[PDB]
Amino acid sequence: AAFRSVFPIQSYSGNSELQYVSYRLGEPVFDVQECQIRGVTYSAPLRVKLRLVIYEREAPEGTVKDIKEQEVYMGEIPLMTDNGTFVINGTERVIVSQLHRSPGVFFDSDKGKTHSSGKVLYNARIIPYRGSWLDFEFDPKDNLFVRIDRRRKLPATIILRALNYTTEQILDLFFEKVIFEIRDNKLQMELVPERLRGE
Amino acid sequence: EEFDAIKIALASPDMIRSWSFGEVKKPETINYRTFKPERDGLFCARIFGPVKDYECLCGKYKRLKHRGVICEKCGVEVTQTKVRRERMGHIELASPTAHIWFLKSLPSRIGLLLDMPLRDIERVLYFESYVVIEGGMTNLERQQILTEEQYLDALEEFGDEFDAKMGAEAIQALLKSMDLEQECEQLREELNETNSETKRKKLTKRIKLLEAFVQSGNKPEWMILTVLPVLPPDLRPLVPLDGGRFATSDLNDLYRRVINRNNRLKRLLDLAAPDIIVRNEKRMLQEAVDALLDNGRRGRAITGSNKRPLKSLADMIKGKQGRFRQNLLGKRVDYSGRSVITVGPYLRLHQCGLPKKMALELFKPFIYGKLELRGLATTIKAAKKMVEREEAVVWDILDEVIREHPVLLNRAPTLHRLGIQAFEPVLIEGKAIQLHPLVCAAYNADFDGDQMAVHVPLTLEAQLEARALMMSTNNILSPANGEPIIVPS
Amino acid sequence: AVGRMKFNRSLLREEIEGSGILSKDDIIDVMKKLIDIRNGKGEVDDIDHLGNRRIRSVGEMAENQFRVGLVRVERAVKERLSLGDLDTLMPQDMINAKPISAAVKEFFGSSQLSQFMDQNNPLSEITHKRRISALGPGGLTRERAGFEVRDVHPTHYGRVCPIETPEGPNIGLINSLSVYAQTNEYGFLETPYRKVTDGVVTDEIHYLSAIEEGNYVIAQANSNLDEEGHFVEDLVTCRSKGESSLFSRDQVDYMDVSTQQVVSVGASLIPFLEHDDANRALMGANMQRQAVPTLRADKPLVGTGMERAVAVDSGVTAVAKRGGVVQYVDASRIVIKVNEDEMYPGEAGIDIYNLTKYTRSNQNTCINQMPCVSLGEPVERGDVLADGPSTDLGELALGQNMRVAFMPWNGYNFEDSILVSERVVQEDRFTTIHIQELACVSRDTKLGPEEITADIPNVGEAALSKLDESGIVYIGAEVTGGDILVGKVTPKGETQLTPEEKLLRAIFGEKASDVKDSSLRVPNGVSGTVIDVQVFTRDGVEKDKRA
Amino acid sequence: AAAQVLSSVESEIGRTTDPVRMYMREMGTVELLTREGEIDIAKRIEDGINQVQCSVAEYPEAITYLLEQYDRVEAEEARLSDLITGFVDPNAENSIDPELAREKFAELRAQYVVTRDTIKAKGRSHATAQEEILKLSEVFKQFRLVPKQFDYLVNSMRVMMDRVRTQERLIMKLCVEQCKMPKKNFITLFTGNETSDTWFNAAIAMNKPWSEKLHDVSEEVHRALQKLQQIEEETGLTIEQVKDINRRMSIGEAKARRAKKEMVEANLRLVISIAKKYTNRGLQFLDLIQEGNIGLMKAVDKFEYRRGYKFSTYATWWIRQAITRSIADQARTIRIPVHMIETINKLNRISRQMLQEMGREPTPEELAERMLMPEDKIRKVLKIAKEPISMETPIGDDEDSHLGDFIEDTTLELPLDSATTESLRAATHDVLAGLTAREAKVLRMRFGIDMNTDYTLEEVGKQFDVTRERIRQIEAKALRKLRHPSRSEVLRSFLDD
Amino acid sequence: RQMLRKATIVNAGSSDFLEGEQVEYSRVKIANRELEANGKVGATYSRDLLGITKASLATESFISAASFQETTRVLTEAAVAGKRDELRGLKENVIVGRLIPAGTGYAYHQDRMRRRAAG
Amino acid sequence: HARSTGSYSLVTQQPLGGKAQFGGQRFGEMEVWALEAYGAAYTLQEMLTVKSDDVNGRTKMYKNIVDGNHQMEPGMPESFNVLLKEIRSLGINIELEDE
RNA sequence: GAGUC
DNA sequence: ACTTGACATCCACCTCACGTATGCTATAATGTGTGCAGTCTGACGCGGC
């Protein structure tokens, strides 16, 4: 997962590149009991096959110049025991499972929550794995504000302006337009029945 | 030194000069190889006193025979190390810095005296905008904020009588010039006429500050600091861990960076540097002083090498882990012991079971004393060696000292006064202490691993108060209800 | 994958997977759902729903921390890629290791989720390994925590045991996984259930997540089963969508496999849980965790059957890989000859079990394995061959069983105080095994080399006699408080004595060299048997004869 | 089109406390004129320096000073170093051969003598003599003095101006603040006469009964004119030319000061980039960039436009130097000198090599070999390497302990220890009384027993009456006495101390 | 009784009273008795109620107050006023390691009090 | 565990903490309050001085106890001096009034 | 991390 | 009981060697680099809006 996310690692000039092939776990340098004795961390070597490829500037993208490759040592990775334990400087340690609020969307309501009035305050929370946080909430007079990286409160509409939506496109996508024909001196709406709903 | 009363007032830079026994010029602490303090450095013995009892730096003058002999070469007085607990040093800042507490702590005395809101003063101090000190020219008045562009377009036309500046220096100046007496009178008359009720409360507040200030005898210009006093070194010590490692106080880090920046200040003054870099350096100056006093009260908190906050002087005072709550209203104590509680059915009301080895240690000194009276111990050194060899005669005499000595039992929580009570303790071997069943209710104690402490009233008066006022037997009725507290269950 | 799945299910989309970055349409549509709820089209999702909370195992934690090492390394990598010459310099000269190993040691070493194993007993270990914390990075704080999150959420059913959490401030934060419960791919907790096809209880097992659980209608384990077919009662007892009550046979969709699936492991071991209030129940589980192995293992007479599984899984015992016949039995080695049926034509059929005997646990406890079977005996795959300390033949043996009588004694049993017989001492039951580690450390300073010697100022031959050549304790020595274990000497500075001490030195005439007694002594109160000694010499300095 | 943008953004600045943001904003005003933009100002530097050097040439004491200082060093046999290394240093637009020095000095002395007789003849600067004076001023200009000794020369003028200003300030305070005489009238008379006292009484000659009551402080008033008039004698420069030189030398100096500022500003941005390259959690941002600034100052001052090479290249090294040397200087609690510092650099950079090549940790032996020195110095440097640790480091996993709560103080003895101390002294005096008069007093002062001062064996002998060795035998006798167990039963318990 | 410790004056005697100033209820009663028996200008007062925190922060002793909470603000108050603490109460003595003005210490403490009366 | 006298704290000069150091147990606010309710001034002062931060006091009282005196002879809390100097360092003038 | 109420 | 003579030991004080402090390196390099973790509790007083 990590490898493909970053790789392949391309240089500035667009002619040299670093590519990832595959990895290998060695046999552990130090055994279980022994590491216990000397105060060592129990680990295996990780060695990874990496290839340096060089394009030419002048020839279009001719990978025909230089191809160098090898297996480099990238350090020792702590190994797990047969028990499911870990050897940490000569003492037995365990990593505990961790509950958190899962990334995605939280639709939260503040029932009472705040106010003498006792007004209903709705907030959807945007939780990533990795990155800053997003909060959308209702102002007391029903106006929509954003907390960006919960810094403070400003108008939601501005964001869509940044995404190059004119006020016209905004209201189009949100609200439902109604056709208002003006003929002679009479004004006539294209009305759907279930808009009179309790009118 | 026996005193009646203590006064607290605004300090003057010159008073700091009196306390201070020398100027701390260098950020360095000590020489890495020769572990002596450096020159005019933070632990310099020339200023703060000699580290070792009756022995100067270079080692010319050791011995009791020498007192007060001030070493010609090194300049250190030969005396008690104890002085390093009390002699203060001093630092001359070339830029008068503002005192953060007087500014950033609400409502802020500076702001209230000047009738000036926060941002104004801030932008002044930080060098974001200029301000009018005093104009012979009627055009502008006290406390006028201007931008870079407004200062030049206004200085083009006039000048001479026109005084405006930037920073803590300017604010210091505005403080000296302001007439406290006059302003008292001004505000009195305003209040005597239309008194918008809310506005009137603020008018009262300002006048009370002023009168309080002039009665106390404190001068406003003292809010701006020129001299910084430096804490005695023993109070911010530097010591070696046993493993070879060193631990030093965080104040010393802050102090060090304070000195660093201050020295670069002096350098850039000498250079006559462009004022942009000058202001930038003075901002850092204030950063370090303000971080020193109260870190994080300035906004951006300095972190330690980890990520955890560097702990400032103020923090040492205020916190619950600060000196008041950890070291002042409560403390670590001698002559105390502790362990698990267990039943004593045979114990009578005023008695408690006290484990041998605990008691042995508890009453060590009394042992030694009475050992020398009966001559059973040649001297005290022999008495120690006797105690370590645990002879049966030791116990006989221990018992005799312990006779009619009442000792104190404590359980957490100490809810009401009966959380601590006195008993005649009687020795039992075994490692658990025995308690009377009747008093379990008062302590809210029960046998399933609760731990209790025991203390020794040491003086005759202590023993007295324990047996009379604290004795279990004397206090049966609850301080709370009129009813009996020590009751069966 | 996680964020994407839950996000797409929040707005009622269709694609399961997605790209990491937020596509612009997503943003608009959620603001739509906010405006919806403000009008009343849809309603609010709960913070504490088990579908709204996700768990991190090992790999995903590892994943994240590995990515961080990578980030820093990327700055370095892209930097050195452009300066130098492209042809003659190779990949191996490019690559740094420091920050990789740094990131790793930070995770494993610095993390608060990484802790000392609880090795009081097999129970503590096994339980502690499956404990689940709400704290840590990206997770809840003490002040940030009100009532809602700490209290009992209905979704914890069959997933987390409700009754295993530390008392005091951390209560509600840390909980034990229930028995049969496991994590799906996504890091959501699932619980297994039996399918019920039109009234008939099948043998088919289906794991459901919290989300999926919210949908269907499931009968409790206690409902009575009609001859491996249908139900006893025409109106039956079940739960669905977070509430409980009555339904007819035909409406029955699913069912619990066993009662014990609601309970954690520790709690499962307590027998008549049914008759114990949860207040004390909770305390019970915690108590088990603080129990200590005596030497003698007496099998628990009143168990839940679960003691066999507990033992087996703890993994402190030896289990038979192959089965066959036992060739050699030692209180140190168990060697086993395999069934010819199972035996690989690759290697020989000889399985080896060197047993671990008498080592030091973290809590000062003793770690002692005892072989269970006898010589030349038959065993099969998965037979219990040697027991850990608190284990009998197959079973968890936390302790021992005694004849107890309920009644008052002359105020010796007052408020839960315990009266015990001398017989307990006499029979050596509940005699604890402790193994403590003591250390001695020889360095060098400006004051000169500290070293290890038998020579110490002003001590009797009492101490001298118990020491070897180098100043070392003899193996098997019986030692008490005040006794010196390992001799050490440290260089003193100047001795500036008071005038009185100057004269006295002269008078008795023992000058005494410029040295300090640094020797390691037995702390007072504790006393016992030096069983083994280990030494770590330096690489530079020459070895001691003891060495 | 710069400062007015600062204003709109500073209006938005919601009390922006970050000095980071403030500095970046301000330096953002100043753009960098490139190419010869810098060299524009380089020209102006050189012109200012030369103009004030023309002033030095015109001032007589300059040549007298030069010859006098040379003569001091030269008189002591023939030293090439010290004061000769400080002066001279004539640029070629070296180990100094006495041959060329004797030659180069010759023509200046020729010109000295030749510039004398013409001046006196008729006028100080009558036409012809003004032509020859210009010729002498061109001879001096050919030299460029080393800045150190040059500063001392400007201090021979600047300080003179300060004495001028100071003495006038005293006169003006005494006259204007104590008496009250129009400075307006002052202008004309002071310029017109200078040399004679005609002005004083000409002023009083316009009546005004205030000039009448001046008798009381008359003895002080014109006598203070003494100090002013005396400075004239001492220097021998005429008032008219004094004025011209002061102001125009002030001109030269001010050209340079106002200039350097421009250079600094346009290269501020360079400092920032350079610093941030080594802003590794080693010191701290602000600290480093301030030091970087210091490096830039160096660059501006030593840079010559004559080199014809790019500014950025040269300055880079000055600022980098400032940064590097400054971490070494400050940073660490224990200050570490430079050569030590660089050895440390070697350490960690080769650590990486050896760790990867050998496989694991670098043991001292192999490291010793690979770095070209003896093992001794390896282990030494190893332990010295470590920095100070936080006193209030939370070692309490729960904020139970700031490591201060571990600290034990060996300085203060226990009350147990004090018990040791007091009893021992008491016991000593008790057996002291058992000793025979003079014997007791001997030991008492020999060891400063109950006497602060322990006199040594010879000093004891001085007080007694000569004899040193007799006291060594009294010593053996007193030892014998106190070894008696009957007396030392009290002393015997301390046998184990 | 501790909560009603302080009062606000509407109207002066001959002292430093005035409009709205808040002083201890006991000190005001002092003025009462002296003035009314001799005549002099009276004071109209209103009794003021201060819960817990307020009452603690208003006490004579700034050591007491500073020991409680709000160390920062306390210090500035006191420093500016030039306040003088005579060490009357419990906590004051406590922190100085002095004998309490109560119980055992009351007999001896009134002894010390008459030592302050004698100059 | 139990302590008579042993290793003391560096800055405040009180006994260190826990059985770990052979430390003296901490006497908290609440516990102090107990003594307060009784009239008991001397025990209080013991806890305040001879048992904690007064070096001269504790040492002197130890040996007087060993000389069969049991006399108190109070001193001055070293924590108090610590406190004083920190106030001076933060730039506020605080001084002990003579009677 | 666990004990006490 | 005390001084002389001889030698032996030790503390002082001055000398020699390493430690310390500073200056220069001249292709060109120039507003961009840190850094994230704080968070949502919770009733409250105060100040400001």
Ligand SMILES: [Mg+2]
């Ligand atoms: Mg209990």
Ligand SMILES: [Zn+2]
């Ligand atoms: Zn000296």
